[PDB]
Each structure stands twice: as C-alpha cells, then as structure tokens.
Symmetry: D2
Subunit: 417 residues, 4 copies
C-alpha cells in the first residue's frame, strides 16, 4: 500500500486537489509507469494528453539535458533566446492559418486560451466570448467561465466574469444536430449579446474533458460564415487535440475551415510546462508592447523539449501511428460492443483521440477499477462520468498496446459476468 504517503498527503495538502490513483509514481518511460513497489502500469492516460511522444522520450530528454548546460530561465521579456523564435517559426509554418502567422509562447493551457481571448478582445475592440456546453478551457476565473461544466470546476467560486455565454455543441448521435447548434449560437445573439459585441467564438475541434466529441465539418463551415458576417474571430482550442493526437498535427488540419487563432499546450512540451497561441499576424499584433508576456512563458527547457517533440512526431511518423493505433482500438471497442449487452452506447474517434461511452458511470468505474487492478491506467470523462477516453502515448510499443487492449476487453467482460 501507499498509506503512510496518503496520510501525509491528506495532512499536508488541501482536499480540493482530487487525486485519482492511490499509488505513487516512481519512474515512467514511454508508456510504462512504475510505482514504489515496482508494480508496472500500461499508460492509457499520457498525463492527460501531455505525452503523445511518451514519458521521457529519448530525444526530448536529450534536448532538455543539452539545454540544462546552457540556461534554464532568463525571462524572455528581459533577455530573449533564439530557440523561442525558432519554435515560433516552426509552428507558423505548420499551423492551419490563413496568410502569414505569428506565434507566442506562454506556460499553461489556460494561459494560452486566456491570451487568445485577450488578443481577440483587443483586435476586435469587443468583450464577449461564446463557448459551448461541456467545453473545457482552464481553471482561471475567465477560463472557468468559458468552461461549460459547473461541477466540480466552478461551483465553489462564486460570480463569473460578465459577457461569457454557452451554446450547444453539435453531437448528432445525441440528437443535437448542426442546425440546433447553429441555432443556439444565434439565440445568444438574439437574447444575450449583440454580434458586434462578441470578440470571439471559442471551441475545441474535439471536445476533450466533455467526452471526445468531434466537430462536424458542416458546423465549422457555418460557424466560420457567421463569424465572417459579424467580424467575430474564430478560436480553435487545441490544448488537448494538438500535436498528432488526431492523426494530423492539428485537429483543424482535417477541415477546410480555418480558425483565426489556435491554442496549444500539453503535448507541445512532451512533459514540460509550455503553451502557445498562433494566429493571423494582424490579429496577434493587436496588443501593444508590454500587453503580453509572463515570467515563465516560453521556458527555455520546455522550448528545447517542444523542438524535439516536433522532430519526433515527424521523424517517427506519429500522425500515421495515431491513425493506426486508433483504428485498432476502435476495432476492439466494436467487438466489445458486440460481446456485451446494454453496455456500450457510443464509440467516438478521430485519429488516436478515441473514447467509448457506457450506459452508466458505475459501468465505466467497474472497467477503470479492473484495469487498474491489472496494470492498465485508464481515464474517464464526460458530463456523466460514463466515458472512457484513450490518451496512450503515440509511441507505445504495439505489443504493449495489445496487452492494454486485452486487459480492457477483460474489464468489460466482467460487467455481465
């Protein structure tokens, strides 16, 4: 057990940080995690979509090791470094942005979303922000307000910032059509905030915490046309979907519609804190000097890591692997859906952004608990906690991926057993 440690944890730290695993990490590499006892876990969490290149990817660690011989922190706004500019250049070349792009780096995912909103507010001269129910954008007061889920993220913290409103995300399998979703945005214009007061509409192309809901292309196209008609900026939040998760570098790369601004974090850094925003030059250039920045933003350590993340994604063909592993997991879920009765209600996938929705959260906890007992680390998500989402490193060895898929099948088999 870890129970002296958990006693220490409960004495020394607040209860408000929920902690899922009862065991403590001692070492991790690629898609394997060891506890203090040497028990091994196959990792289908990825630190919540942060390790698309795996724990301690060798080229990421080499890059960080080399940067530790140079410097770890100067504060970019005091003394800049070339690697930050180069990383911006590499992202500008790769991002789906219309016309010349520019990029800046911050530290956290919430900061990237919040600075995209700052940039959009200042470019448009407007305050309003429209997001979607079940969207997840951060734990800041502004990003909590944008977040479309009150429990547990914001119910403790009182009044939220004005001018943030939630529309319906298109989920046709749950009877929310593209029409209904567009109509809910229009109701916000008619009821809550005039279109010329809305600075940005912000959405995840694949909703992450909200349950791995993939946006229909038709919804993006009609949303783009609405934003173009009213001068509103369109923001794709790719904090969770970016860096090869969906089988292309950015989820937006699957669509013809382009966003004006795109946010990035998590596996950008391959396990080190960094985030960023890339977007149309003219939009990014709206804030005045001193208007953007941050102490830790663009950390030299995490910039060295991110350069190696891009290298690895392209050198190891990890977009392709994301599609290959995704399809294999989807086939296993369809067979579970057949082998079971009254359990699987939906299978959603784009690349290796894959989830299975179960009728009941109790069912999903049975599977998650069994997996944990048997050396497989699984995350749930969703409004009702009945979704298992799959976030294994895209570098996971195929034979170990199969072992995980087998344990998953075993966990489901215990439900009617």
């Amino acid at each position: 057990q870890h129970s002296a440690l958990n006693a220490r944890k409960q004495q020394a730290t607040p209860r408000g940080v929920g902690v899922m695993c009862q065991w403590y990490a001692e070492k991790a590499e690629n898609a394997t995690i060891w506890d203090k006892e040497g028990n091994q876990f196959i990792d289908f969490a990825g630190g919540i979509a942060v390790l698309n290149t795996g724990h301690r990817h060798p080229k990421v660690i080499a890059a960080v090791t080399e940067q530790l011989t140079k410097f770890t922190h100067t504060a970019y706004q005091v003394t800049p470094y070339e690697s930050y500019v180069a990383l911006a250049e590499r992202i500008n070349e790769r991002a789906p942005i219309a016309g010349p792009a520019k990029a800046a780096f911050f530290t956290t995912g919430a900061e990237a979303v919040e600075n995209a909103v700052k940039i959009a507010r200042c470019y448009t001269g407007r305050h309003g922000i429209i997001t979607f129910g079940n969207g997840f954008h951060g734990r800041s007061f502004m990003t909590m307000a944008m977040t479309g889920k009150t429990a547990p993220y914001k119910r403790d913290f009182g009044v939220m910032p004005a001018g943030v409103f939630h529309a319906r995300y298109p989920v046709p399998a749950k009877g929310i059509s593209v029409d209904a979703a567009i109509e809910s945005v229009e109701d916000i214009f008619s009821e809550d905030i005039a279109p010329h007061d809305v600075a940005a509409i912000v959405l995840e192309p694949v909703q992450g915490e909200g349950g791995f809901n993939v946006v229909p292309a038709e919804f993006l196209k009609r949303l783009r046309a609405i934003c173009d008609k009213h001068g509103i900026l369109l923001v794709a939040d790719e904090v969770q979907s970016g860096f090869a998760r969906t089988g292309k570098l950015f989820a937006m790369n699957h669509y013809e519609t382009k966003a004006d601004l795109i946010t990035m974090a998590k596996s950008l850094g391959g396990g080190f804190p960094i985030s960023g925003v890339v977007g149309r030059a003219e939009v990014m250039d709206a804030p005045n000097p001193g208007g953007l920045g941050g102490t830790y933003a663009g950390s030299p350590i995490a910039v060295a890591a991110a350069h190696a993340v891009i290298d690895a994604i392209e050198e190891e063909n990890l977009c392709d692997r994301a599609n290959e592993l995704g399809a294999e997991l989807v086939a296993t879920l369809k067979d579970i859906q057949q082998a079971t009765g009254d359990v699987v209600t939906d299978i959603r996938a784009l690349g290796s952004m894959v989830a299975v929705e179960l009728e009941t959260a109790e069912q999903a906890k049975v599977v998650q608990n069994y997996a944990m007992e048997n050396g497989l680390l699984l995350l749930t998500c969703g409004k009702y906690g009945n979704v298992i989402r799959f976030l294994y490193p895209l570098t996971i060895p195929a034979e170990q991926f199969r072992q995980g898929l087998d344990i998953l099948k075993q966990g489901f088999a215990t439900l009617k057993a």
Copy 2:
C-alpha cells in the same frame, strides 16, 4: 549583423505585444553571469526578475533536476501523485508564517498562485470581493490583471475587467501616503464600493515588486489585520517576488508579527523552473471541494525537485544572511551615489536584498541602465513612472563580481554628473 538577422526573424515570427528588453540574446548563464551569442559577459542584477535567488543553474538545483529526469517529468499529479510534491508541501508548511496548522498546494505560475488564493478565499468566505492596492502587481489573467494596480501596459488593451475588485492606496510615507491615509482608503472602499461582508480577501505584496519596491510598514499590517478580523475578511500576502530569502528572511512576512491567512509563492521557489504555490491556514485551504483545484502542469516533478534543492541551498548556504549582507553593501553604495550626485536620487528603499533606487526622472534611470548594459551589467527598472532601478541579483553572486557590478553602477550614475 547575425543579431540583426535574429531580431528581424523575431519581428517576423512573433507578435509585438511581447515587449523584449535586451537587444542581445542569451547563450549561456551561470550563477550571476550571462553570456550572449557573441561571447560578451554580463553581470546579472536581474535574476530573471527575482526568479534566480539561487543563481542560474545552481549546481544543487541542476543535480536534482538531472536526477528527476531519470525518473519522470510529468504524470499530472491529479492523475498519479508523487511523494516529492507531498514532501515539498510539508517543508513549506513547516516554514511558512501561518497561524496554526498549514496546508499547501502547488500550481505552475505566479498568477495561478494568486488566482487560486482568491478562489480559496472566495470559497472559504462565500464572498466575492477583492481589495488590492494601487501599483500592486499580481499577474496577467483577467482576474489578476484587474487586481494589478497599473493599467498601462498590462490591461489597457483588454476591455472590461471582472466585477468586485477595487484598489486602495498602499502606504508610502516618503511619498506622503501615511498609514492613516492608506487605512482610510480601505475604509472608503467599504463605505462606497463594496460592503465588508461581501469582501473575500484583501491582497497585498509585503514589498510591492513591479510597483517600486515599497516595504509595507508594520503598523499598516497590524491595522489591516484588525480590520480583516473584525469583518471576517481573509488577509493574503503575495510573496511571488518577495519570497525565498530575497528580504533576508525566507518570507518577507517573517519580518512581521502580523500573520496572513494565505501566502502565495512562485519565481525563486523553483530556482529557474516553472512552479508556484499557495500555503495557508488548513481550514481555509480545505474549503474548495475535491475537483475544485488542480491543473495539468501544476507541481511539475522537475520543478518540485528543483524547489527542494532551492530550500536546501538557502539554508545550507545561509542565503538569508547573504541577502542582508549584500543588501547592506548595495545600500551604502547608493547612499554614496546620492551624495556624490546633485539632483538625481530621490529615495533608497530596502528590505534585505529587495533594494531599489528611485531617480528624479525615467530618462535618468534609462541613462544609467543603458550605460550599465554597454559595460556588462544587466539592470531592471520599475515603478509607475519607470524611474526606479530595482536590484534582483542572485543571492549566490560572488562578492567580487557584486563589487564590480556596484562599480559599474557608480560609473553609470557619474555620466549623469
């Protein structure tokens, strides 16, 4: 002209909104020495803006990070916890000036620490309002920008700020704002803006940082404490810049009898790696419900290892004592400068090695700053009017290199004369 080529790339690839002070780029840094790409050496009196009290790449810090890189760099603590996080909370709880048992949690940025202290205070009190002070600086989120008591450049571009945040006058008796006047301005907020029983917290830097290194009078803290106790308001000390030995004790609040309910930390906590934290009264910290606090990069394993070694170094190397010794020597140099000069120096402010000199004019401050830069000395300015030079050299700076820095500083002032 290679640095000309690099600054052209910077402007082409990144937004103008990130203001960058140095025209040269960092190639390597160690303790209090920074080298540019062409080999020129700079004495660091900036410390990455108070992030490097233990110096760039302190050997102990780097050794601890090197060892953690062989273990894991990221699990998401809320998914899989680690013992080093618990242990770091225990070490801060033991040291922090908190009445009764303390608890602590770690996030990533200084703004997150401030924003979570506000979340916790709102939760504990069931109130929404926040009082901060003019010239206070608390972060670049929408909520921490509203708390920050300087509109330009930080928040003028970004439109409406969240409700329930108000600014009082910080006590600066040298500038004719007495403790009485400052306390009276808090009471006017109660009388005019927001009832005391709707105020969750009063938040202040014990030494305002960006605001000009203004040291809070003890009488102001004790009167403020009595007002908070009387009204059930929490008192929050923001030590993101003042903490980890800068002022000659571990926390600036250690110089005072009065205790805060919550204390925020970041910057030199991590010795050059991204981490932040909040420590405070256990029953206040436990107010948010599980799930209510957290964050992907929070308490990064890398930065937690670094922070353990920062505390080790501060206590093993007697860096509180060094802060007092170096500050005393810098203050004597500033008083000599004040004598040798005519109409230049207006104030000298100091707690430990949180030291600043105020000049009549920002043109004067820039003349000294740029002389220093051309003679191998990196200096920062501050203050509502940009006429304050603040000193944030590593507390580990070799005494002979510090002396050289003070000689260059004196020569810079002499070019005024």
Copy 3:
C-alpha cells in the same frame, strides 16, 4: 397632417425614442382616442396594457381628482400615508401567495422587477438570475440583461451585468416542448451557474412583448419543483398580464403553482405611474430598513387611482368581460384564419391577452397600416414583428369592439386582395 409637430419632435428630442403613430393625441376616453383634427381611433393598444379600465375611467379620475385636493407627493419614506398601506392590504388579500403576503409600491415596471431581484438576492444570499429568451423586463441595465431580446433594446449599450442567463420558454406549437424548456434551465446549472448561486428564476406567465406565449401548467409545476429543490425563488413578472387582462386578476390565478414574488405595474395604475411587488412575507422582509424605497414610489395620485382600478375590476366584472371579449376576438381570428390563405400561423389567448401570428412581418404591417387608415390602433410584437397583440381596454363598449373586429377583418382581407 402633423408635420410641423413631427419636425419639432425630430429637432427637439433624440431619435432613440421610437414613436409609432404619426398623429398626436388630443383627448382619449375609455377605448376612443382623438387626434388634433378630431379623427377618432378605436384603441386596441391600451397604452400597451396600461388601461384595462380604459382611458380616464370615471371612477379612477374621481379618485385622482379627490386626491389632488389633499396632497400629491410627500415621499412615503419621509411621511407615509394611509392609502399606501391600504393598497398593500388589498393586494395582499388578492395575490396568489403561499402564507401571509407583504407588498411594497414603486413607480415603474422595471423598478418592480428590479426590486424583486434585489429582494430575492438578499433573501437567498445569491446573485444569479435566470430569465427566458423573448422575455421582456425593462430598460435598466439589470432589466435589459434579463430581457431576452437584444435588438433594439440593448444592442447599443455594451457589457451587461454578470450572472444573468437565458433559458428556452416553452412554446410547444413552435417545437419547444416543456421538456426542452426544463432541460435548457438544467443546462444553465450544468454550464453557467451552480444552482446554489441562483437567487431567482423570473418569468412572465404570459410573455408580453415576446408574442403572447402562455406558460403551460406543467412547465410551472416542474420549474417550481426545481426551485424548491435548490432553494431558488420563483418570480412571476405580471407587469403586463396583471389586473384582469387574462380573465382572472393575476395570470398566476389560472395555475396551482404559486410564485414566491409577483411584480405588477401598467394597469395597476389605470393610467398613472405606479408599480409594486407582493410576495411571501419572509422573503419581502429580507432587506434591511433603508434597503428599499424611492422618491416617486407609491405616488399618492397613482395609489388613489389603483384603489379605484381594483374597485372597478370587481364592481364591473372585468375579469368576466376579459373572457367574453377574448372569446369573441378569438372567434373572429379563426374566421380570418379560414377566410385567408398562407397568412395566419397561430392564434394564442388567455382571457383578453390575445394575439395572432402572421407568416410575415410585412403582412402584419399591412394589417396594422390598414387599420390605422381606418380608425383602429393596433400593436405588433414578437421576435420577428409578425405578431399582432390585442390590448383593448376591458371596458370597451361591445358595439365599438365589434367595429374594431370588422376593420381588422377588412385589413386581413386586403392581403390576398
């Protein structure tokens, strides 16, 4: 023509006050209005539901005439009057409130809604307010935010107060079921604001400006149960539906569900400015002394009028007349619906709160213009301006009501002509 007068109007007053009629009122009595030339108009507007007892009802004018011999203004909070207390007593006896009621009077409809929100905020200790799309509650910043229509009421005026959210009003004929409406309230709890932060849900039992939509009893029952479960107060806005319009004194009198607070204005005063709120004693008593009031609130003139309005409604059986006239108008609309093709899409009615929805606003303007040409004054309303709403005094002579109905039939007959 009135065109020297209109020239004077455009020179001297702002354009933002829209004015419907091009002719000016010179005299009005019961349901007849004369212009300067002696042209007569049958009044189906009622000054927008203010004159359920008619222009210059003789007993209302006698009451005001008698009060003009006594006093017109003392400021109730300085010097009170017995008639205000008596009016509260009469409303307390008549209002559908559970347990003992209390009542206060203000001046405008928006004030009554805003004070109901003040009372609810203070009783519950919460800030949030939920309203419905197409709801109309006033032109104050708070009541504009509550109002579910951005054009033309709030699109000019920028950021709205935080904590106000819009759900879907149940309109089954337009495919918004009771289920869908309840589900939209629950989505607000899940996405925008936790239920323990919502002070009140505020709705018109019959939406007025939003197009005369009558609330299904089942929606009120389920909304009551939701509010009871979460401690939220339920507010019926009867500013437009009250004082016999719907064939009972209050629209809420048709339902078993009771609201906690009810707002009143318009025909409360029979043509003189007054408004009020009545509700559960315990709720009304929540604000502290000095917390409610107003210079003109409870004007002695308009209190004398309102006493005579209640007298007249009961003495002249105006609830019954409201049902009799309503049914007669509904029969005429059904015959128009038959006599026409592709014109009438809905007929809605509760008592003499009656409306006809046309396919097109252009159609409704053809009818309104013809009526005006032929001595009948008609109002439109609705999100799309395609609804004609009927607000004739309940005292209108039957023969003149028939003359109006005939002109209305003629106006419709010109559409396919």
Copy 4:
C-alpha cells in the same frame, strides 16, 4: 391610538425594507404646510426631499393637471405622442447649459434619468466605464446603486454590483480634500482601475445631495472638463436634486463656466408628479438607435403638464431670486446659532437655497430634528455620518412661515446648550 393602529397595519402589510421616517401620516399638504390625520400642522422644510420647490399643490401646477385630466392621462408616448412632451423638450433645450444645440427626452424616475444618461454616454463613446464620487447618490437600480457612493443602507443587502464603476474623491476643502487631491484620485482610477479610453462618462452632482450638500468648486469642474476633453470622456451633471431653481439659478451648473455634455433632471421638474429627463448635446443624445430609449410611463402627460407649470411658476414668481433671499436668511440664522452655541456646529454649506448645517454628532442632529418635529417643523438629515441637517423648504414658502421655522430651529439648537 388610531395612529398606533395604523402603524401596526403598516408593519403587518408592508416590508421592513422601506424605512419610514415620520411616525405620523399625511392628511393634506399645501405650499409649505402639511397636516397629519389628527389636524396637527407641520412647517415643511423637506419638500418631499427637494421635489416641491414650487410647494405642495401649487395652484398653477394643480390647474394644469386638472386640465390634462380632461384630456388624457396616458397613451405611451412611443405608441402615440403628444405635443406637450415636444414642447417641454423645447423649453428645457432652450434653458439648459449645453454647448451647441441640445436635445431632451423624458423618463419617469431620477434613477432612470441617470441610467439613461449612462446608456447614452456608453452608446456615444462606445465605452463602458463610469466614474462617480464617494458619497454621490444616483438611484436604487443595480447600476445606479453601483454609482451611488454609499454602501449602507443602499446596497449592502444586494450582492455583486456591475463591473466598470469606480469612485473618486469629491472635493471638500473644508474636510481636507483639496481640488488637487480630488483630481489626483480620478487620475489614480485611470492608472489603476480602468484606462481613460474605456471610460464613457464621469458623473457628479454639482451639489452632492444625500452626500451632505457639498458644492463643487469651479476649479474642480474646469480641471475635470479638461481631463474629459483630453480623453474623449463625457461629463454628466446629475441635477436630480439641485435642479429647478434650488441653487438660485435654474440649474446649479448655471453658476459655472464649465459645461456638461449631459444633464439629468427629476424631482422638482414635476412639482410633485412622477417625471424625469435628460438634456444634452444633440449629437450625443442622438447616439442610441430608434427603439433604444423609451419606457411605458416615461414623460407622463399628467407630469408633463405639471412641469410646464413649474417652469412657468419659477420664472413668473422669480423663484431663483427667492431661493437666494431665503437661503441668505437661513444662512445668517445658522451663523447666529453657530455663535450662540459651543461645540455643536462644524460647517455651514450653501448654494442658493441648497443649504445645510453639519453638527459634531448625529445624536446632536437627531436632538434638533426631533425637537423640531415635536414643535411643528419637519427637518431632514443627510451625510455619511447622519450629522448634517439639510434644508429643502418650498421656494414658495411664505416669508412669515419660514421665519417661524427658523425660530423653531433655533429653539431646537438651544436645547443642546
């Protein structure tokens, strides 16, 4: 004991939140005489709180209202306009101190006039922020409560206030708040709270009313005007209490060279009937689009007739001159009281017949107020500390009855001695 029976009915039927000052009830009032239900006579130095500059039931006013009652009492001006409204706008436009052509519109309450001046300013500037002053009083709506610079009793019960409203220090040189300090506090708001280009208006009473009858220094208006011109901010004069001859000219702003962009009016505008208005620069007033301004009771025909007769009476009866004569006589009495007494009078403030006396203590103010009440003289108090007696007698009060009132006042002060 019939008045005991009535106060029991009051408490049973109405909320405690309406604070009522007099224990007796009004039966009749005329000019400056009020009679209770038992026949006792009171000299009115309250004027219904500055509503009766022309006295209770001024014969001209009542004649005008009596005539309008034979015509119509309510059409809803936005449905059917009336000429008397246009004519009233013309008469105010002619008289108001506005640079260039003016326009005016009428609403119902003082708070509505203030709230619509803010709506207009927000629209014209496209900005949201509002600066008011501590102790300013502007109404009881959520927006005007936020503007009001006194939290108790007015807004302490009602939770969060709308964003973008901040309070500066009003200049009171007798209390050690110089014009310099007041101007500096506005600039600190720009520096700390809200950028100048996000401020729509600065709003102030030229003579603060509830705040203690503080007369604005001319130098403060001219410096404030220069700051507004420099930043494109509008200057709003709130004359709800100061207007219609109280200060010895029609508007208090008529005493000053500096002109406001917008002026609000109510209270004695209507001579005892509910009406308010906003007058200002035509191009500012025309900013909102048609439909953007309005209101059911706005510009009530009854109150418009009364207001025409108020202006007639002010100019025909030379009530500006009477205001100066009566104020001068009251001030000489206060200075005699100040001499005959020891430690009681601390200030005498006066513009015209907006006159107040400040005492050391509110217990002192209540002793005088209650002596006066028991000897047939109705007096009001004011001020942050309730230690100010303010004088609002009708400007029509007979000189011999005014003299009697001043003799009772002197006797009341003597019971201190």
